[PDB]
Amino acid sequence: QQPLLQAIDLKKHYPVKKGMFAPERLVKALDGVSFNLERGKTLAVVGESGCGKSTLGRLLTMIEMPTGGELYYQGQDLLKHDPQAQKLRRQKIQIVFQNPYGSLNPRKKVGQILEEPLLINTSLSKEQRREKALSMMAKVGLKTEHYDRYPHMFSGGQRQRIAIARGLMLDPDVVIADQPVSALDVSVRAQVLNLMMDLQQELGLSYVFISHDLSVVEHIADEVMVMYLGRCVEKGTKDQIFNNPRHPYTQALLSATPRLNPDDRRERIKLSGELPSPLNPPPGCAFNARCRRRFGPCTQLQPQLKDYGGQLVACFAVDQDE
Amino acid sequence: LRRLGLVIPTFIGITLLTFAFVHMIPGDPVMIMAGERGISPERHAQLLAELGLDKPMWQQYLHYIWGVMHGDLGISMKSRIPVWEEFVPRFQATLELGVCAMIFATAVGIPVGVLAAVKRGSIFDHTAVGLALTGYSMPIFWWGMMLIMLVSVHWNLTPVSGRVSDMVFLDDSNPLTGFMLIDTAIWGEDGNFIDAVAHMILPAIVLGTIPLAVIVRMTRSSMLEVLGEDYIRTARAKGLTRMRVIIVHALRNAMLPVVTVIGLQVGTLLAGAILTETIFSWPGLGRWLIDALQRRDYPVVQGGVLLVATMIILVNLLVDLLYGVVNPRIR
Amino acid sequence: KTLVYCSEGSPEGFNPQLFTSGTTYDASSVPLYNRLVEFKIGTTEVIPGLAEKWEVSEDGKTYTFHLRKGVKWHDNKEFKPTRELNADDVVFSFDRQKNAQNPYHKVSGGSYEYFEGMGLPELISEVKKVDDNTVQFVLTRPEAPFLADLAMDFASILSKEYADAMMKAGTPEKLDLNPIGTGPFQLQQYQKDSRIRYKAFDGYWGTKPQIDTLVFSITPDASVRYAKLQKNECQVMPYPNPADIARMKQDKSINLMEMPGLNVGYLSYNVQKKPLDDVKVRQALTYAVNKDAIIKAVYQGAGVSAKNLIPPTMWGYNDDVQDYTYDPEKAKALLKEAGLEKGFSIDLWAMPVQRPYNPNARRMAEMIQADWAKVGVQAKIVTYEWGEYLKRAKDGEHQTVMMGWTGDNGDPDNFFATLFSCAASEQGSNYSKWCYKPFEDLIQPARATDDHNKRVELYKQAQVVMHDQAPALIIAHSTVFEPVRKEVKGYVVDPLGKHHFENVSIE
Amino acid sequence: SAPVPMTPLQEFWHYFKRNKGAVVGLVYVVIVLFIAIFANWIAPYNPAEQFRDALLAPPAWQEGGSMAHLLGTDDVGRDVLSRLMYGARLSLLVGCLVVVLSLIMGVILGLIAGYFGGLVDNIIMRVVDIMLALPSLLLALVLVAIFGPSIGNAALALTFVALPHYVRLTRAAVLVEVNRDYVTASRVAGAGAMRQMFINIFPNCLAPLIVQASLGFSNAILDMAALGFLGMGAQPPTPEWGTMLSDVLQFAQSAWWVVTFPGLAILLTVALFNLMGDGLRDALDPKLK
Amino acid sequence: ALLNVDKLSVHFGDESAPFRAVDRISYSVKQGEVVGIVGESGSGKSVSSLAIMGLIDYPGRVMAEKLEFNGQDLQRISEKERRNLVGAEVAMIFQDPMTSLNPCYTVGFQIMEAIKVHQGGNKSTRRQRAIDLLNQVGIPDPASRLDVYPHQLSGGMSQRVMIAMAIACRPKLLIADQPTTALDVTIQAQIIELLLELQQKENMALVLITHDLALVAEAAHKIIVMYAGQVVETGDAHAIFHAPRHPYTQALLRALPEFAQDKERLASLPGVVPGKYDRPNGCLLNPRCPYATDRCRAEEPALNMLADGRQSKCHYPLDDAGRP
Ligand SMILES: Nc1ncnc2c1ncn2[C@@H]1O[C@H](COP(=O)(O)OP(=O)(O)OP(O)(O)=S)[C@@H](O)[C@H]1O
Ligand SMILES: Nc1ncnc2c1ncn2[C@@H]1O[C@H](COP(=O)(O)OP(=O)(O)OP(O)(O)=S)[C@@H](O)[C@H]1O
Ligand code: SF4
Ligand code: SF4
């Protein structure tokens, strides 16, 4: 049987113009890669700020069409319309937005935002939708007084939780979680992550979990994917990546994570050299300008994912070591 | 090739609607030319057949659009001059007034409707909006005669009515363009330009009054939606003077409904200035089209609606292009 | 020396043969052209124009005109005359309008609307050039009004020398668009719907104008015309709105000139419609109306109240008949005799446009409605745009319709014949559908008969029989008012509704 | 304890209160409506009865005026006050129907145009450019030829010349909103096209439409007055504020009241619909909650 | 002190039933200090920061005994004189960058305004210093990405544009509202090393509001822990997390993934925050606290000053052992 989600070589590129009559340049926001996602499983996505993760999340959610590659849900092509399927496929794949304030309609109350998923997709009467909305709000540490509020009369970590509540509402098969816990304190983060893990165990809900906080990914993930400059650089099980990181971007990334105990604290790699541009990405390996393991092929050829014991790594120095 | 889009369906729509509409109105140009007198049945049938009016409306329409496709708008049944040579001198006088009215109405209506939002609930807000809705709800005949009687007749500050001083004439031997503010500035004698702008003041005030209240209210409403947004909080916090938070940050986001009403009101200022043109004796398109419609001068109603329709399509296409300058997200 | 006149709207063009509007004749006939014979200013009286002398045959079928020596034409940037005025110019001026094979007949659309409306196609048999300075009109029947018809604006004389110069130059429309005439002024400019500039013609055969140039400032609003006149932007104006007349009487900077106008406003009863087919009902609906109140209210004192169709200042007026003067009591009694004391509904059609003869037909219909109301007749005011009003009125769809006439030529035939004759019924201008034999047998012989006393006698009888039969309310004759600056000398008000400037001085 | 739940109406009224001008506005609108519907129980006289001895009798406080006619009389001697109060009937009705129908169709077409974009938008925008080009008198004469002389055929002519303004202002708002993340998030929840434009986007578009509807009452009377210079308007003895102003504009420098009181009746009803519009903006504004 | 806040409170809603978003907060910052603010989502940290700048709008009401900056008590002076003090000498990094940048101007315009107001250079100097700042915040291609609109930025780029725009103000005090939310751990470390070299060289004050306990422990000099509108603990950054003085700070540190097994359920306080209608009498932590005495259910604990200079808003300030 096919995976619950299966991406193959997904690309997305954005037009940019310096002025209304200027030449239309192309931003390489995702020159991306395949993945398989199975039921009851979490795939975390980690990497540089601006490296394409939210762009990937928009493709998987069907917010945008890709500029290339394929996207299957359960063996059904998501990139062509089918009216008998699309009503079900729409409720079965859902998102938690990054910076979710702009994703909450300012002229709506939080109860209306959380009931809308139910009102479109279910038979639930008014009292049963209010019951579901308040029940989901309670499970993220909101309150019956918040159901009546407009989205600007909250803190950012409460807007995160309104976006989580809306995403988890439907019993979906996949949730694309775009920075879902970053504006939460560690006690509310623990409550939300415990809810996401309880739903993964009870419902079979899978996650694509986009996070910059590595301490959370080291806990919730089952597979982890590392991204740089629109492309994937390493993929494996969570033990493989956190115990033996092989791509020198992953080594520099995992090395910079803050840790509360003073002893545990270590010097970051202090990557030095010009950053690569999404408008003209360098020939060959994207990281070459800042990489410590410099070697001949890197400035010339595009590296690709090789197996090395199920740990997919896209690096010529790891190929030379092997 | 041309940028308008839908060029064939647009032309067939404007022309078939205008043609079928003027030919549904009861009466004929011959019947109205005769007035209270009779025209005998045998001479009425002759003169309709000579103008081409006895044929069925499908044949008459095809003959008209065949002529227009080959570059001919026809002959005006009032003036006996081609509809184009009648249109151009009047379109020029209508642009010259509609531009002065819009320059006044925007140059006053942008500052005043910004201040009415910045100073909400003040004596200024209620006075500026009250004054604006006063000018908006007087008939142009009453408002225009109040200005003529006060400013021109009592105060002696302005000329009464007309385009330029009645006994001062330009030479036709100079290459006149037909815009008196241009013509008198380049080829007029001493004081002749000052006279041409002195005749523009009251017409521009009266015609620009009905845009000014839309611009004042629309800019004020749009400002009140913007001044509470999180990026205006950032502009206040960045240490900018209040003039920059208002003019640079807020007004830029308020302009989109404002440039929409400027575009809609320019459409009215081409087609519909008739009451101001009547009071101020202005040789514009509004008097011309309504006199043609009343006389059943079918070529002038058909050709004038097509040449007003094209200028409206182009102004609406320009402000639709201008939305992407105001709000880059729309591009 | 310069005069500025504030015109009521704009001219349709500059050949007066093609056009029906007085605002065109003021721009295009009076200043630019002469006619064979012409009206003495302020009167109906015909005096020598381009003909010094004329003779009528004993049968009335031939009119001979002896043309004036030394009459010379205008000059234009495309034309200078070699000739004075010939009989050939007179012949072409009327052959253009009558003859389908003439070079100029179809030029500018061939809409010779007065020539054809007066029946001159039927009447004029020939236009003969007797000699270089003599012209003959031969007529298929005699008509006494014909000499006054040759005094109208369509009878203006056009140059054959210019006409065939423009025809061999391949541009015949210049005869109509770039005018050459014999008149006291020549056209320098026309700025479309704005202003007209004229120069006094230095070679004119009459008295040369005492103003060197004349300007029409086209000013379509009657209240703004008085503002231009108050400020001395303008020295003369037409058609003052009735409300300002009171103020103008008091204004020390102007003379408000007055003349009993040769026009009539009337409400026309459709005799083919069941309540109005009875003379008693038409008399009652007349007795029921307070005309003096309509004069004070609608006309604001600008009219004089009307008892029969011909204006009181015109020849042939029957002053020896007494009106159906306001008497509601009398009105109610006369509908009881008709069997209509139970009342009836009636349609009262009112034009939305202003007229010389009726300044507001809506508020007049609202007064006739209240007047008829008090007598038990339920008047319903109906109104249509002017083209639909003319169409359905000629088609006979109305019960009563507001109407009027402005005298073309000052002859009573121009009224009775054109408004209440069987012929007029045929052409659609008999808005009463009234054919009465005893009226016809008077008004007809009075058209043909040359004896002015017999015309006066038969028209006096036509007014007696028409008053007894009452085919209309006859409401009022408008006084024509001409606000003129005190600095203007020699102005005289024309009863035919034209404006003249050749005898006018500024000092 | 928690307060009583507030119905939308309750919230709307509660937040409409805070604007002292907006409730002065609604009080006037209910006063002219009460005066209009009950005019036959309140007006001094029957309109279309003429006091022929008193033509242009001035207001009761002027020299030669009389307490018999508080606001004086017109040029046919009718009471200006009785004509204003019966004149509130047709003027409020055609003003409200023109604004209601043009706002309804303008919202529908402008939502469809801005939401769907592309060929739909181009067709719709071309259509409303053609409607801006057609003179109002031409539409009026055509509607009279199809449907006969009626007050409703002036209301339809006035509806179609006003409709472009609502269509284009609605589209201009919808083009900003359709790009924002809450439209996307509602699409991901499963909202179809009707829910997206009418339930989710439209609440964010009202600030220009409240301005246009508040101005659109003035035009529905003054352009009815401009048609009233010709054969289109009310049946002549029956009062309407725009017609009874257009009939008397030659009495401006003499007899000032006949123009001035219909002028005040329109001006106040315009000024005070604009005060209600500010209150309706404030009551729908979440930042004021 | 540079900033001196005393009895600060902020209320939302009608005066009759105010929501105490900030509730007798009192703290100070010296020139060159870094102050961390830590606490539950909804505890008043943003609203406190907005109140000390006057950026709370009509539905909210601000009050204090003292609210003074650089020798001026900001409530007594004219709003004109408050504005031209606070805008010239104070800067803020707001929490959501997507709504805080103006939608209709390029990144370069929005940064170069700050350089013009606060530094005053010509247009070519303003571009060069904007490239220098965009390089300091590690934007991938600064000379092209000046000419980019906020909707074309990623969330962690728009965040770094407003860090650059705050540093462009050359301020005396900087309030940083979760300045590392949308940032990867490598660029997060660059931003903190940038803000601290700025504090060390230009002697500026810094206020780090953050949920990342490890980052504020490394960076801060003093930490303020905040709950339900009140300060609950205050003291030296290297002390607060080593041995905490308040049951809230203890239960917050217990929630970290560092103390949990490879896939297991994380620890947390077993309850929900007090709102408008269910606010305790006495201590605000009453229904959640493991150590709640009936004195807590009766009496509002004072901000009790301890022998080691640190403060705890508890009747029973915790020992080094982690017990009452
Ligand atoms: N609509 C757009 N138009 C142009 N450029 C865009 C657009 N949306 C995103 N980008 C660019 O696409 C690239 C990838 O951005 P993202 O998809 O947000 O990357 P990302 O890894 O999710 O970054 P984070 O997680 O949001 S910090 C960046 O260079 C963006 O500036
Ligand atoms: N306009 C408002 N009306 C009502 N409540 C509001 C309003 N704005 C904010 N709140 C409340 O203000 C309290 C404090 O909000 P913030 O200061 O923004 O929260 P915070 O401590 O910064 O939490 P984080 O760090 O931003 S998740 C929260 O409990 C909100 O419920
Ligand atoms: S391919 Fe070379 S430059 Fe790229 S990550 Fe590997 S070692 Fe570094
Ligand atoms: S005072 Fe009591 S309830 Fe409050 S934190 Fe201390 S032990 Fe807990």
Author numbering:
A (entry chain D): 9 to 330
B (entry chain A): 6 to 336
C (entry chain F): 29 to 535
D (entry chain B): 11 to 299
E (entry chain C): 2 to 325
Article excerpt on this structure:
Using this strategy, we determined the ATPγS-bound DppABCDE179QFE187Q complex structure at 2.73 Å by addition of ATPγS and Mg2+ prior to cryo-EM sample preparation, and we refer to this structure as ATPγS-DppABCDF unless otherwise specified. Structure reveals that DppABCDF forms a compact pentameric structure with an approximate dimension of 70 × 70 × 140 Å. A DppA molecule caps at the top of the two integral membrane proteins, DppB and DppC, in the periplasm, and two ATPases, DppD and DppF, adopt a closed conformation in the cytosol. Unlike apo-DppBCDF and ATPγS (or AMPPNP)-DppBCDF, which adopt an inward-facing conformation, ATPγS-DppABCDF adopts an outward-facing conformation with two ATPγS molecules bound at the interface of the two NBDs. In ATPγS-DppABCDF, a striking rearrangement of the TM helices of both DppB and DppC, which form the substrate translocation pathway, results in the opening of the periplasmic substrate entry gate. Specifically, the periplasmic substrate entry gate is open to approximately 9.0 Å in diameter in ATPγS-DppABCDF. The two ATPγS molecules act as molecular glues, shortening the Cα–Cα distance between the D-loop T182DppD and the opposite D-loop S190DppF in the RecA-like subdomain from 10.4 to 5.6 Å. However, in ATPγS-DppABCDF, the DppB scoop motif, which consists of two short α helices (α1 and α2) connected by a scoop loop, is clearly resolved. In particular, its α1 helix and α2 helix interact with the C-lobe and the N-lobe of DppA, respectively, whereas the side chains of two conserved charged residues, E41DppB and R42DppB, from the scoop loop form two salt bridges with side chains of residues R383DppA and D436DppA. Taken together, these findings suggest that concurrent binding of DppA and ATP to DppBCDF does induce conformational changes of translocator, and the ATPγS-DppABCDF structure snapshots a typical pre-catalytic (or ATP-bound) state of the transporter.
